Structure formats: structure tokens, C-alpha cells
Motif scaffolding. Sequence first.
Motif, short mmCIF file in Angstrom:
data_model
loop_
_atom_site.label_atom_id
_atom_site.label_comp_id
_atom_site.label_asym_id
_atom_site.label_seq_id
_atom_site.Cartn_x
_atom_site.Cartn_y
_atom_site.Cartn_z
N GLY B 21 0.79 -1.22 0.00
CA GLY B 21 0.00 0.00 0.00
C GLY B 21 0.82 1.27 0.00
O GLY B 21 0.63 2.14 0.85
N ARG B 22 1.75 1.39 -0.95
CA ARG B 22 2.57 2.59 -1.04
C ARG B 22 2.55 3.15 -2.46
O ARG B 22 1.93 2.56 -3.35
N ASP B 23 3.22 4.28 -2.67
CA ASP B 23 3.16 4.99 -3.93
C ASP B 23 3.77 4.17 -5.06
O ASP B 23 4.67 3.35 -4.84
N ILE B 24 3.26 4.39 -6.27
CA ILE B 24 3.72 3.63 -7.43
C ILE B 24 5.07 4.14 -7.90
O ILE B 24 6.06 3.40 -7.94
N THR B 25 5.14 5.43 -8.24
CA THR B 25 6.35 5.99 -8.83
C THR B 25 7.53 5.89 -7.88
O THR B 25 8.67 5.64 -8.31
N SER B 26 7.29 6.07 -6.58
CA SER B 26 8.37 5.91 -5.61
C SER B 26 8.91 4.48 -5.62
O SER B 26 10.13 4.27 -5.56
#
Lengths: 246, 246
Positions: B21-26
Motif C-alpha cells: 500500500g505505497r506509492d507507485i512511482t516511488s
Amino acid sequence: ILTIKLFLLINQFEKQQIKKGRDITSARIMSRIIKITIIVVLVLLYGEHFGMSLSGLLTFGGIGGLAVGMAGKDILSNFFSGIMLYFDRPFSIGDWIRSPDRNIEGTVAEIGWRITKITTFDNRPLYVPNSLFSSISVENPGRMTNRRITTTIGLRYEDAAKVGVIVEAVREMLKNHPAIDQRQTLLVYFNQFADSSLNIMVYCFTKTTVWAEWLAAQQDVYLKIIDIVQSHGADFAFPSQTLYMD
Amino acid sequence: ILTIKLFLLINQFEKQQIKKGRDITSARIMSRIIKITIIVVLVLLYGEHFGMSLSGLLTFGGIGGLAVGMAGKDILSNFFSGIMLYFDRPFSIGDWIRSPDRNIEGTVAEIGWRITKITTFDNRPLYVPNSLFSSISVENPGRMTNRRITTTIGLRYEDAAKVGVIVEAVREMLKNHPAIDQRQTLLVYFNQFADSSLNIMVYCFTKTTVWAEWLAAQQDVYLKIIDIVQSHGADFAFPSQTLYMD
Ligand SMILES: CCCCCCCCCCCC
Ligand SMILES: CCCCCCCCCCCC
Ligand SMILES: CCCCCCCCCCCC
Ligand SMILES: CCCCCCCCCCCC
Ligand SMILES: CCCCCCCCCCCC
Ligand SMILES: CCCCCCCCCCCC
Ligand SMILES: CCCCCCCCCCCC
Ligand SMILES: CCCCCCCCCCCC
Ligand SMILES: CCCCCCCCCCCC
Ligand SMILES: CCCCCCCCCCCC
Ligand SMILES: CCCCCCCCCCCC
Ligand SMILES: CCCCCCCCCCCC
Ligand SMILES: CCCCCCCCCCCC
Ligand SMILES: CCCCCCCCCCCC
């Protein structure tokens, strides 16, 4: 066989640590760290009789060791300063020490290998890293020979004609006091002009070095000074001002 | 085959991170960074059995590793200090600690591997890097043995003839108080000349170490001191001045 023996030793160490009554996950993480560093050391050491690369292994080990050496400077500094204190330390257990550079004032309780334990006058434990004693000046009030008494007598500007006799009387009283060390410095002189008063300095020492006796002698001296000043017709000066009304 | 396996592992790690559940681009950028460093390590390692240059590769790897080692000093310092705290720490969970060098005052809540979590008396979380505990002095008020009471009694200059009896009465009252530790320091002495008052020092300890009981005992002592001072005909001194009118 070497790897198996080392892993057995690490597992035994972890089991003993758990038996000592500490956290589980922390012990597992510590064991994993020790295993990883053992593997790294073995690879760096056994990378030729089994491995193939030489320059790559040398460079990797060199940069890793260089980073490790830079990162662990402070802990090693504490350890080395602990060794130096073990061989040459300017204090003992039970000594009252202080420093004009840092706040370490208190009584020494323990001298360990990484930190030194000091009991403050607030009755609290204080932990000082050992590396401090290699760079700061340490004073040892626990080894003093005398206690100093210093004060200032501020007379009114209208009492300028009694300064000489007051100074003489105070000097005589100090010279005849049974609690004052006559072999130390003893100075009583009209010292400086102040905003509202003419200041007289007092400077002497007591024979005793005990807290309570020094305080009692100081109180006796102060009361005698008050009596001497008031007996000559002078008086102490409050802060003063001249007011022009309009 | 090694490259393919490593890339598969990195892709699986990125997929798991996204699933967490974390950012895609990061996540993509982190995966790219890990891939780049893996390629660099492989080239530095496999640059002989496949590559040709030796001195150039050695110099490039050496300078890269030297820069990396200098840049990552602080994170490694935090990690090493965390290990040292794990083996030897001068406090426990739930201990009130402070320091005269930095602002870290509060109650210890968690001791991690990189930072230590402290709950301030403002009921806020405070995160302290672990490397601080290798260079600053740490005090542990949570392990005190007594609470100290200190104050100053400022009498008027016209009350110089009652200082002795007032000091005696205050000392007797402190000696007969049920909340005062009689085995600790207990000092009451006429201490110094002030601008507007004659100052008397008070110095003692309480048996209890609890906040509320210490405060209650201090309040009781202060009220008794007020009664003692006013019963002897003396009084407390306001700041004073002498005014010459014109
Ligand atoms: C039974 C005592 C076990 C002691 C374990 C010491 C581990 C030292 C590791 C050093 C790694 C370089
Ligand atoms: C969550 C438990 C595993 C954490 C692993 C951390 C590994 C860090 C490697 C850093 C290499 C530069
Ligand atoms: C779960 C345990 C993780 C331990 C990771 C150790 C990584 C050490 C990195 C040292 C870099 C020079
Ligand atoms: C009392 C037992 C002390 C064991 C010390 C182990 C030190 C491990 C260092 C690991 C460095 C990465
Ligand atoms: C369960 C732990 C998984 C992650 C381990 C990472 C180890 C990295 C070692 C790096 C050595 C330079
Ligand atoms: C990174 C350097 C760590 C050195 C640790 C030395 C510990 C010595 C303790 C001796 C008495 C327990
Ligand atoms: C690594 C630090 C070693 C410090 C050794 C100090 C030796 C002092 C000798 C003094 C003899 C009186
Ligand atoms: C499923 C767990 C994946 C863990 C990934 C760790 C990546 C470490 C990279 C180290 C590069 C030197
Ligand atoms: C915008 C995404 C790509 C950014 C690439 C940065 C590469 C920096 C290289 C620095 C070499 C000294
Ligand atoms: C889009 C991702 C860009 C990642 C760039 C990494 C560059 C690392 C430079 C290290 C220099 C020693
Ligand atoms: C919980 C998983 C931890 C993974 C740590 C990866 C570290 C990557 C270091 C990259 C350095 C350029
Ligand atoms: C999509 C990213 C394009 C830019 C990548 C730059 C990589 C530079 C690596 C330098 C290694 C020393
Ligand atoms: C550059 C050095 C990075 C070292 C990272 C170590 C992380 C250890 C974490 C162990 C518990 C999650
Ligand atoms: C790399 C840092 C390792 C620090 C090891 C400290 C060991 C302390 C042992 C104390 C035993 C009571």
C-alpha cells in the motif's frame, strides 16, 4: 565445518541471551547481524582458495572496511579513553569533580570502560562518555587545601572619609579571627568606584575544607563586618538615583 | 542467469511493496536504484573474467566506494550506536532522562535500531538519533534517591540583628520536620550580601521521590518559613532604592 561450528556458537549465544531474560525478536536480529558479518568476513578471507576474483574482492573489502572505520570512531574513542583512564586518571572514586568546559559536576561513583558514572548533588546518576576526559580541563574540588571567602562592602559616597579606618578595622578583625588561615592571601582594600557605592574587596581563606564549618565561619565573618561598618557611623548603600522633577 | 534471478527478486520485492500500500512511482524509482547498484556491483566484480581493463576498473570502483563511504557516515553511526545501546544502555523503557548538552528531556518509550522514541512532558513523541548517546552526557532523574529543596530568604538590612535567631529557628524546624531526610545534607546559613537584602540559604532533601508529595512538603516548608520569619519581627525585602530629589 568452520561455518557449522560458528553457526552453532552463535545459536548457543542467542539461546543464552534469551535465557538471561531479554526480548526475543531483538535477540534474533542480533544473531542475524552476527551471522551476516561472519559470512562477510569469511568471504573476504576465503575468497581466493575458493573464489576467483582478486581486485574486485580487494576493492569491495577495502571500501566496506573504510566506511566501517569512519562510522565507528566514537565508540572506539570511548574505549581508548577508558583504557587511558585505567592507566592514568586525575581522580578517584568518591572525588568531587567539575569542569569549566562541560557540565559534569558531581561525585565519582564508577569508572567503567565506556562511560563514567557520577552522582550529582541533586542525588541523580549522570553518565559521561569517557572520550570527554581527553579534551576538556578537569578540576578536582575534592582535593582542595582551603576554602575561599570573598565579598564586597559597598559604602555610601558620603562615607568617603571613613574608608581608611573601616578598612583598617576589617583587616585587624580578619587577622585576629581563629578560623582564618594566616599563611594564605589576606587582602582588604578600597577597590573601585561603582555607580552608587564605594566598593571594598575582601579576600581570605579558612583552615577547614568542610562545607558546614566553612559556611559557619563565613556567616560569623559577615556579621562581624556588619557590626564594624555600623559602629563607625557609615552604612551600606542601596541603588541610588537623582531625579529632576517637571 | 545470475542477472535474471536478481532482476526477478527485485521485481518481486517491488510488487510486494506496492501490495503493502505505497506509492507507485516511488516504488519504481527505488527498484531502478536497486537495479543500478546491482549492475554496478556485478560489473565491479565480474569485470575480469568477462571484462578487460584492470587498473581503470580498480580506480573507478575505489573512488566510487570512497565517496559512498564518506557520504553514508551518519546512518552507519546511528546503526552502530543502536547496537551499542542494545548491549550497554544507561536507561530502560519508562525512564525519565535528560541531558545538559541537548534537549532530549522526557520518558523513554522505544529503543529502536536507528532512533530512540521519547515521550515529552508535553505528551508529544520525540525521535532522537542513536548516535547522540555516544557523545553527550545523559542524566537519569528516573533513578534519583531524593528530591532537593532549595530556596533563599531575603531579609531587610534593618533586620541584621535577628539573622542568628532566625537561622537557628529555621534549622530547628527543618530538623524536626517529618518529611525531611535527616541523613542527607541540611544547611541553613547567612550566605551573602545582596543589593537590597541579606540572603539566607536553605538546602535539604525529602525522603519521597514522588512529584506531588515533594511539592506538598515544599509548600508546607515554605509556609512554616514565612511564619517563622514574621514571628520574630523581621520581614521580606522588596527591591529598594534611594532617591535624591531635585
Ligand atoms: C558464550 C559466549 C559467547 C560470546 C559471543 C561473542 C561474539 C563476538 C562476535 C564478533 C564478530 C566479529
Ligand atoms: C526488515 C528486516 C530486514 C532489513 C534488511 C536491511 C538491509 C540493509 C542493507 C543495506 C545495504 C547498503
Ligand atoms: C534482519 C537483520 C538485518 C541486518 C542487516 C545488516 C546490514 C549491514 C550493512 C553494513 C554496510 C557496510
Ligand atoms: C557480553 C557479550 C558481548 C558481545 C559483543 C558482540 C559484538 C558484535 C558486533 C557486531 C558488529 C557488526
Ligand atoms: C531477513 C533479512 C533479509 C534482508 C537481508 C539483507 C542483507 C544485506 C547484506 C549487505 C551486506 C553488504
Ligand atoms: C567498535 C569497537 C567496539 C569495542 C568494544 C569493546 C568492549 C570492551 C568491554 C570490556 C569490559 C566488558
Ligand atoms: C590505546 C590507548 C593506550 C593508552 C596508554 C596510556 C599509558 C599511560 C602510562 C602512564 C604511566 C604512569
Ligand atoms: C522479499 C524480501 C526482499 C528483500 C530485498 C532486499 C534488497 C537488498 C538490496 C541490497 C543491495 C546491495
Ligand atoms: C529524471 C529521472 C532520471 C534521473 C537520473 C539521474 C542520474 C544522476 C547521475 C549522476 C552521476 C554523477
Ligand atoms: C530514475 C532513477 C535514477 C537513479 C540514479 C542513481 C544514481 C546514483 C549515483 C551514485 C554516484 C556515486
Ligand atoms: C524492509 C526492506 C529493507 C530493504 C533495504 C534496501 C536498501 C537499499 C540500499 C540502496 C543503496 C544505494
Ligand atoms: C530513466 C533513468 C535515466 C538516467 C539514468 C542515469 C544512470 C546513471 C548511473 C551512474 C552510475 C555512476
Ligand atoms: C548505509 C548503512 C545502512 C545500514 C542499514 C541497517 C538497517 C538495520 C535494520 C535492522 C532492524 C530492521
Ligand atoms: C560496532 C559497535 C559494536 C559495539 C559493541 C559493544 C559491546 C559492549 C559489551 C558490554 C558488556 C557488558
